[PDB]
Design an enzyme around this catalytic site. Sequence first.
Site, mmCIF file in Angstrom:
data_model
loop_
_atom_site.group_PDB
_atom_site.id
_atom_site.type_symbol
_atom_site.label_atom_id
_atom_site.label_comp_id
_atom_site.label_asym_id
_atom_site.label_seq_id
_atom_site.Cartn_x
_atom_site.Cartn_y
_atom_site.Cartn_z
ATOM 1 N N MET A 15 13.106 47.674 -38.551
ATOM 2 C CA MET A 15 12.468 48.959 -38.331
ATOM 3 C C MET A 15 11.473 48.876 -37.175
ATOM 4 S SD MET A 15 11.752 50.022 -42.262
ATOM 5 C CE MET A 15 10.656 51.361 -41.913
ATOM 6 N N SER A 70 4.410 47.986 -14.323
ATOM 7 C CA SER A 70 5.425 48.106 -15.368
ATOM 8 C C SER A 70 5.081 47.393 -16.663
ATOM 9 C CB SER A 70 6.779 47.648 -14.876
ATOM 10 O OG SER A 70 6.890 46.240 -14.884
ATOM 11 N N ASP A 76 15.457 43.285 -29.372
ATOM 12 C CA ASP A 76 16.357 42.434 -30.134
ATOM 13 C C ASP A 76 17.766 42.937 -29.927
ATOM 14 O OD1 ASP A 76 17.893 40.974 -32.062
ATOM 15 O OD2 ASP A 76 16.242 41.024 -33.480
ATOM 16 N N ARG A 95 6.783 29.001 -26.813
ATOM 17 C CA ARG A 95 8.161 29.540 -26.818
ATOM 18 C C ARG A 95 8.390 30.552 -25.676
ATOM 19 N NH1 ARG A 95 11.235 28.841 -31.061
ATOM 20 N NH2 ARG A 95 11.916 31.060 -31.155
ATOM 21 N N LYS A 101 11.529 46.703 -34.585
ATOM 22 C CA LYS A 101 12.270 46.580 -33.342
ATOM 23 C C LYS A 101 12.952 47.883 -32.924
ATOM 24 C CE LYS A 101 11.373 42.438 -31.995
ATOM 25 N NZ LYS A 101 10.308 42.171 -31.039
ATOM 26 N N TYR A 118 11.206 44.240 -40.212
ATOM 27 C CA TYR A 118 11.344 43.640 -38.877
ATOM 28 C C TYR A 118 12.254 44.547 -37.998
ATOM 29 C CZ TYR A 118 13.082 40.913 -35.050
ATOM 30 O OH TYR A 118 13.428 40.544 -33.823
HETATM 31 N N1 LIG Z 1 13.845 33.803 -30.574
HETATM 32 C C1 LIG Z 1 14.872 34.690 -30.693
HETATM 33 O O1 LIG Z 1 16.033 34.314 -30.868
HETATM 34 C C2 LIG Z 1 14.673 36.191 -30.618
HETATM 35 C C3 LIG Z 1 15.725 37.045 -30.959
HETATM 36 C C4 LIG Z 1 15.542 38.437 -30.847
HETATM 37 C C5 LIG Z 1 14.350 38.913 -30.342
HETATM 38 N N2 LIG Z 1 13.352 38.053 -29.994
HETATM 39 C C6 LIG Z 1 12.064 38.577 -29.580
HETATM 40 O O2 LIG Z 1 11.538 37.925 -28.474
HETATM 41 C C7 LIG Z 1 10.128 37.747 -28.585
HETATM 42 C C8 LIG Z 1 9.903 36.256 -28.407
HETATM 43 O O3 LIG Z 1 10.510 35.535 -29.466
HETATM 44 P P1 LIG Z 1 9.959 34.140 -30.068
HETATM 45 O O4 LIG Z 1 11.009 33.569 -30.955
HETATM 46 O O5 LIG Z 1 9.357 33.399 -28.905
HETATM 47 O O6 LIG Z 1 8.764 34.776 -30.924
HETATM 48 P P2 LIG Z 1 7.895 34.048 -32.110
HETATM 49 O O7 LIG Z 1 7.706 32.625 -31.651
HETATM 50 O O8 LIG Z 1 8.424 34.388 -33.492
HETATM 51 O O9 LIG Z 1 6.484 34.789 -32.011
HETATM 52 C C9 LIG Z 1 5.805 34.834 -30.778
HETATM 53 C C10 LIG Z 1 4.322 34.835 -31.053
HETATM 54 O O10 LIG Z 1 3.978 36.088 -31.681
HETATM 55 C C11 LIG Z 1 2.660 35.935 -32.080
HETATM 56 N N3 LIG Z 1 2.359 36.637 -33.330
HETATM 57 C C12 LIG Z 1 3.032 36.575 -34.489
HETATM 58 N N4 LIG Z 1 2.380 37.285 -35.445
HETATM 59 C C13 LIG Z 1 1.286 37.802 -34.871
HETATM 60 C C14 LIG Z 1 0.164 38.635 -35.308
HETATM 61 N N5 LIG Z 1 0.115 39.070 -36.581
HETATM 62 N N6 LIG Z 1 -0.761 38.959 -34.396
HETATM 63 C C15 LIG Z 1 -0.695 38.543 -33.112
HETATM 64 N N7 LIG Z 1 0.283 37.758 -32.620
HETATM 65 C C16 LIG Z 1 1.269 37.378 -33.465
HETATM 66 C C17 LIG Z 1 2.459 34.439 -32.459
HETATM 67 O O11 LIG Z 1 1.240 33.939 -31.923
HETATM 68 P P3 LIG Z 1 0.466 32.581 -32.438
HETATM 69 O O12 LIG Z 1 1.501 31.524 -32.460
HETATM 70 O O13 LIG Z 1 -0.513 32.425 -31.342
HETATM 71 O O14 LIG Z 1 -0.088 32.954 -33.832
HETATM 72 C C18 LIG Z 1 3.739 33.765 -31.982
HETATM 73 O O15 LIG Z 1 3.519 32.521 -31.327
HETATM 74 C C19 LIG Z 1 9.733 38.356 -29.901
HETATM 75 O O16 LIG Z 1 9.332 39.720 -29.631
HETATM 76 C C20 LIG Z 1 11.043 38.332 -30.670
HETATM 77 O O17 LIG Z 1 11.180 39.282 -31.713
HETATM 78 C C21 LIG Z 1 13.508 36.724 -30.122
HETATM 79 N N1 LIG Z 2 9.457 37.217 -33.459
HETATM 80 C C1 LIG Z 2 10.685 36.720 -33.666
HETATM 81 N N2 LIG Z 2 10.845 35.401 -33.899
HETATM 82 C C2 LIG Z 2 12.051 34.843 -34.158
HETATM 83 N N3 LIG Z 2 12.119 33.527 -34.415
HETATM 84 C C3 LIG Z 2 10.924 32.636 -34.486
HETATM 85 C C4 LIG Z 2 11.300 31.115 -34.381
HETATM 86 C C5 LIG Z 2 9.966 30.357 -34.394
HETATM 87 C C6 LIG Z 2 9.238 30.551 -35.707
HETATM 88 C C7 LIG Z 2 8.897 32.044 -35.837
HETATM 89 C C8 LIG Z 2 10.215 32.839 -35.835
HETATM 90 C C9 LIG Z 2 13.174 35.620 -34.128
HETATM 91 C C10 LIG Z 2 14.523 35.422 -34.318
HETATM 92 C C11 LIG Z 2 15.151 34.216 -34.577
HETATM 93 C C12 LIG Z 2 14.940 33.108 -33.724
HETATM 94 C C13 LIG Z 2 15.537 31.856 -33.927
HETATM 95 C C14 LIG Z 2 16.422 31.701 -34.993
HETATM 96 C C15 LIG Z 2 16.689 32.784 -35.843
HETATM 97 C C16 LIG Z 2 16.053 34.018 -35.638
HETATM 98 C C17 LIG Z 2 15.143 36.633 -34.126
HETATM 99 C C18 LIG Z 2 16.463 36.960 -34.283
HETATM 100 C C19 LIG Z 2 17.552 36.116 -34.030
HETATM 101 C C20 LIG Z 2 18.863 36.554 -34.295
HETATM 102 C C21 LIG Z 2 19.115 37.828 -34.836
HETATM 103 C C22 LIG Z 2 18.035 38.671 -35.127
HETATM 104 C C23 LIG Z 2 16.741 38.221 -34.859
HETATM 105 N N4 LIG Z 2 14.195 37.567 -33.859
HETATM 106 C C24 LIG Z 2 13.002 36.956 -33.845
HETATM 107 N N5 LIG Z 2 11.792 37.505 -33.638
#
Ligand SMILES: NC(=O)c1ccc[n+]([C@@H]2O[C@H](COP(=O)([O-])OP(=O)(O)OC[C@H]3O[C@@H](n4cnc5c(N)ncnc54)[C@H](OP(=O)(O)O)[C@@H]3O)[C@@H](O)[C@H]2O)c1
Ligand SMILES: Nc1nc(NC2CCCCC2)c2c(-c3ccccc3)c(-c3ccccc3)[nH]c2n1
Lengths: 249, 251, 251, 249
Positions: free
Chosen positions: A157, A136, A142, A13, A159, A155
């Site tokens: 808290m 950096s 988020d 991702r 962020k 979650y």
């Molecule tokens: N996707 C969104 O819409 C969204 C929205 C707001 C903020 N963000 C932020 O952007 C970043 C990227 O998002 P994403 O959706 O790509 O994230 P994600 O897929 O939910 O998580 C990214 C990776 O975090 C690692 N992880 C989870 N739990 C862990 C643990 N206990 N120890 C070590 N590693 C751990 C996992 O590694 P493994 O798979 O290798 O276990 C996972 O593949 C995150 O910080 C997320 O909160 C994303």
């Molecule tokens: N680490 C992490 N992972 C996320 N999503 C991942 C998706 C792959 C499976 C692990 C969870 C989110 C999402 C998410 C991302 C997509 C849809 C809804 C919330 C959000 C997210 C999206 C909208 C509003 C607030 C949070 N943050 C997040 N942080």
Amino acid sequence: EAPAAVVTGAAKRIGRAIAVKLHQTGYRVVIHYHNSAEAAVSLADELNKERSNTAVVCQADLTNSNVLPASCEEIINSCFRAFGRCDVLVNNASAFYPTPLVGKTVETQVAELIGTNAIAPFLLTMSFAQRQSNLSIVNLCDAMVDQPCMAFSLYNMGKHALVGLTQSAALELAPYGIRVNGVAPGVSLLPVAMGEEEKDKWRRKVPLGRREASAEQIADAVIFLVSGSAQYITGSIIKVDGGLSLVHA
Amino acid sequence: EAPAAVVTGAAKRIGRAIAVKLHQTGYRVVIHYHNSAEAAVSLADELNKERSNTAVVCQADLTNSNVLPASCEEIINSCFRAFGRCDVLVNNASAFYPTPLVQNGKTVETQVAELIGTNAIAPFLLTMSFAQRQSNLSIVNLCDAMVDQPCMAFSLYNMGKHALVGLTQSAALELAPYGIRVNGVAPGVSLLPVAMGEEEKDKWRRKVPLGRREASAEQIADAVIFLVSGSAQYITGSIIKVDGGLSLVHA
Amino acid sequence: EAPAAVVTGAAKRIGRAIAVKLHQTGYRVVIHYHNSAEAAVSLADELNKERSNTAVVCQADLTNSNVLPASCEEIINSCFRAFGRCDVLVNNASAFYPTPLVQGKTVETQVAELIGTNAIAPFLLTMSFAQRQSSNLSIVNLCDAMVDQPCMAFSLYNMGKHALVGLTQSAALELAPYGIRVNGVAPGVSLLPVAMGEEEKDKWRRKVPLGRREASAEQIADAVIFLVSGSAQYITGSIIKVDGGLSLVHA
Amino acid sequence: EAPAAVVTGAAKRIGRAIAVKLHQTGYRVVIHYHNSAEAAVSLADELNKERSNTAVVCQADLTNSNVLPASCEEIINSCFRAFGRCDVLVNNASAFYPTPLVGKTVETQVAELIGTNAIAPFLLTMSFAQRQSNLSIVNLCDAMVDQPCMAFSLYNMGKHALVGLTQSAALELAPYGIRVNGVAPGVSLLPVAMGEEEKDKWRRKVPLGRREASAEQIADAVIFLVSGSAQYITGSIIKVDGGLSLVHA
Ligand SMILES: NC(=O)c1ccc[n+]([C@@H]2O[C@H](COP(=O)([O-])OP(=O)(O)OC[C@H]3O[C@@H](n4cnc5c(N)ncnc54)[C@H](OP(=O)(O)O)[C@@H]3O)[C@@H](O)[C@H]2O)c1
Ligand SMILES: Nc1nc(NC2CCCCC2)c2c(-c3ccccc3)c(-c3ccccc3)[nH]c2n1
Ligand SMILES: NC(=O)c1ccc[n+]([C@@H]2O[C@H](COP(=O)([O-])OP(=O)(O)OC[C@H]3O[C@@H](n4cnc5c(N)ncnc54)[C@H](OP(=O)(O)O)[C@@H]3O)[C@@H](O)[C@H]2O)c1
Ligand SMILES: NC(=O)c1ccc[n+]([C@@H]2O[C@H](COP(=O)([O-])OP(=O)(O)OC[C@H]3O[C@@H](n4cnc5c(N)ncnc54)[C@H](OP(=O)(O)O)[C@@H]3O)[C@@H](O)[C@H]2O)c1
Ligand SMILES: NC(=O)c1ccc[n+]([C@@H]2O[C@H](COP(=O)([O-])OP(=O)(O)OC[C@H]3O[C@@H](n4cnc5c(N)ncnc54)[C@H](OP(=O)(O)O)[C@@H]3O)[C@@H](O)[C@H]2O)c1
Ligand SMILES: Nc1nc(NC2CCCCC2)c2c(-c3ccccc3)c(-c3ccccc3)[nH]c2n1
Ligand SMILES: Nc1nc(NC2CCCCC2)c2c(-c3ccccc3)c(-c3ccccc3)[nH]c2n1
Ligand SMILES: Nc1nc(NC2CCCCC2)c2c(-c3ccccc3)c(-c3ccccc3)[nH]c2n1
């Protein structure tokens, strides 16, 4: 000589798109991962095929515990071991699941959600700084942090804490020439298994294009923040949310 | 009968003033404390002398650990045990000390557990226990008006207080359908340690636009009193700065 | 065929640095100016030597008045006249001086210049920009990183910049369906007047965590260039501070 | 001697509630109005019935123009002339209507929306300070200022400038003992002039009670801020929104 970066949660991702772009810009990379062992190793292989020994993997649970400080120090050490330097840290790994106020115990939910999103970033920041020119740190925040999802208090808290860290560490590390910034996605790279109908429900909310961000679009903001085009930028959190955080209920 | 409030870290300083003021408003109070046993019991006495059977003490460490949830549940239990009800929770207890990124006795895991536990995780767990047990119900979190211009080398403390802002908002949203309001009071600089050097006290007081003085503990309590009152019944998820303009002053 | 950009107040300092960088990135530019006629024409001269028929100047007062809407429409019109298109608008022109609340210019003039240049003209240029419309269309507003720690006695300037934040958000939202992205760049301290006192400059420089120096005009422009680029295709309603950490520093 | 307050836009709705509540607390009031002449006079009648010579009216357009500073000076003057002092200013009057980016001329819309919401508050603040206990100013802000209604750019710009004024004036007037604060409603007093698909739509989004605020609930926050219980509070904006601002799209 080429700079080096640690990306946490870089197997899949957004983390993966960030490591790929950093590598494409000329960086050598530590691909940190937890459970996604096949994806991480195959990513590192794809990158090393492109340029010899410019990628290594590093497995670590970033849940809060008595061993987390040592684990984070070892992630940073792994960058020096492989590449002899560590110029960039990207705090990307993150646990995400609801924790209602009213079969994991709560103390485990606390440890995972606060550990991955705030405490591990802090510990990695400490080790990054201690082990030290364009240094950096980029923290994945988020965009919706002030309009939180229902039942996602830990979650959220986590962020919020991470915003606090971004600011505090920018102030404290500026005299060492280390800039500290954030990238704040809105909705990005919706889960492949999520039904298109529910995917469309989030897409409909986004003003710019009624779609989610690509992982590469998030990566682009990271690449900017680590570039020399952001040399005076520190303590800044750039939203990459297509206007989503601007939309009222 | 009378409503009941739990005030964490209520034996001294700002917590004590909040307890005193809630008690004067008609609340029965649980005075939680960690190390300040004498001050706590002495406060309970003074408040019970004033109205019998209206204060108790409750001891607990609010450092993070695997038993913190049980300790938070027992705090809310001690209020029901003593008064039959729990109307107000005030999350006031807080550790505060520097944790530099580049290098007491304390291990970093201890620093993490104290600063993040007291400022964020215990408030979260107490908020859970409060809601699970459940009128004009509300929670007030003691935040920090300077949270976006942090003290140098106070990373963990600042992460804590940022987390507490997030909890205030998340719990306001989630607990609204249960009629539980969740708000914050954010002091700037308040009740300077009597033992703090006079030169340093002056340096803080000089920074404050409104009166060039710190807040009294009573002034902080006044905002808590507002937020739990019937004059704040539509107010949830709000954090009121009580800072004399300090947060507005540029470098 | 090269895209075209309007830069307000681009004869000098930060506005010129932005115009130059856009032009090097390949844009044709409208250099707007108010009083600095010679500096504007000279800049357009250079840029045309670099590539012919890729710059023009455009004179306008951006003080608020009943004809301001026509003046803003004519600015955008001047880009379409010179270049057949208008892709980017940068709202950079700005009045800045104290307007004390207690006591040449009348207060009416102060309101007109400070609120006109910092907020109303940006709003009217945004309207005309949207109305007069492959594409990567966007608007960048020059905001201020210290907007929540305002300079003493700069009320009207600060209100203007706050209104600009509101415009950035409001226009991001409303122009998103048209493919028009609206973002901000928020300098802290940048480009000290050559004849500000050696002591006064040093006072500002010492406040800045990152390097104890003001930003260069190029550094502000770099952030503008990022936001207009395809590397920012999903970014709208974002304000990027470029302040060396200055806004994080408590008093 | 009883303290005196000016309330702009005090003939109807939230402004009227604030005047009533201030009068109930012991203030003498100046009731400013623009078009609602019968309601203003009716309110002054009602409050003077309670206590003789404690309410007067003042008419003024607060649209921006060359005459607005004089108009604002006369509003403050009407308080000195009637009551011999002016302890509290409440900036409540506000124009509110859509001004799409893509009837009134635009320059008229600018004058009205920016004038009522920002420039008149600034001029009234200058006049109030210039004429000077427990002195304070309360600005009626908007809890949804960062998630603005679609096509309300000028109104939102005016309200953002008002935040600016609140902070700037808090800082500058602190040495004179004048506190400057804000009260930011979410949704309050839905008109009967509104369909009930529409009203229901707004009510349903409010977490706390699924209803709008009463004018009295907004007034309660103003009362607190002007009171002796807010003696250390300056530059603070209290949302009174039932959690509406926290609800994501
Ligand atoms: N996707 C969104 O819409 C969204 C929205 C707001 C903020 N963000 C932020 O952007 C970043 C990227 O998002 P994403 O959706 O790509 O994230 P994600 O897929 O939910 O998580 C990214 C990776 O975090 C690692 N992880 C989870 N739990 C862990 C643990 N206990 N120890 C070590 N590693 C751990 C996992 O590694 P493994 O798979 O290798 O276990 C996972 O593949 C995150 O910080 C997320 O909160 C994303
Ligand atoms: N680490 C992490 N992972 C996320 N999503 C991942 C998706 C792959 C499976 C692990 C969870 C989110 C999402 C998410 C991302 C997509 C849809 C809804 C919330 C959000 C997210 C999206 C909208 C509003 C607030 C949070 N943050 C997040 N942080
Ligand atoms: N004072 C200020 O200038 C200021 C500024 C900004 C924010 N605030 C906030 O306002 C609140 C009150 O401030 P304050 O100066 O009165 O607080 P404080 O004296 O620093 O702390 C209050 C109490 O917290 C309790 N506490 C500390 N560590 C604990 C632990 N591990 N477990 C359980 N309890 C613990 C202590 O109880 P025992 O004494 O019983 O051990 C202490 O008396 C705090 O949340 C603070 O962060 C204050
Ligand atoms: N410099 C900083 O430290 C700093 C800090 C925070 C924010 N900013 C923001 O960054 C931007 C650029 O800063 P700067 O220092 O380069 O700005 P500046 O030198 O103060 O102003 C730029 C130009 O604005 C134009 N301008 C002024 N009044 C005008 C009017 N009534 N009508 C039309 N144009 C008018 C002037 O054009 P002529 O010369 O043609 O008359 C002036 O050259 C501004 O928006 C500023 O507020 C700068
Ligand atoms: N109601 C809400 O849900 C809500 C939400 C957010 C913020 N607020 C804010 O809270 C305050 C009170 O809200 P409201 O709904 O009571 O306001 P409102 O009824 O829309 O307006 C209050 C008064 O403003 C006066 N006014 C309007 N244009 C004026 C002008 N050009 N010159 C002088 N006075 C003028 C009018 O007086 P006349 O009747 O005498 O002509 C009007 O009665 C406002 O500042 C509003 O923006 C309200
Ligand atoms: N739990 C807690 N306690 C505090 N102070 C107490 C004082 C008695 C011994 C335990 C620590 C502060 C202070 C404090 C309070 C007074 C002066 C400086 C900072 C602040 C504080 C003050 C100004 C700016 C930022 C933080 N937060 C705080 N939180
Ligand atoms: N349009 C405009 N121009 C500015 N400066 C110019 C300098 C050239 C002559 C007209 C005024 C500033 C400054 C400025 C820039 C440098 C030092 C102090 C404030 C600031 C500024 C700097 C630090 C904190 C708050 C505001 N904004 C500004 N906006
Ligand atoms: N001066 C003023 N008046 C308002 N309403 C009045 C209603 C009487 C006729 C003149 C306009 C509002 C409203 C309003 C108030 C109720 C419903 C929707 C928006 C809002 C409002 C409500 C939600 C989000 C953002 C703004 N602001 C406002 N300001």
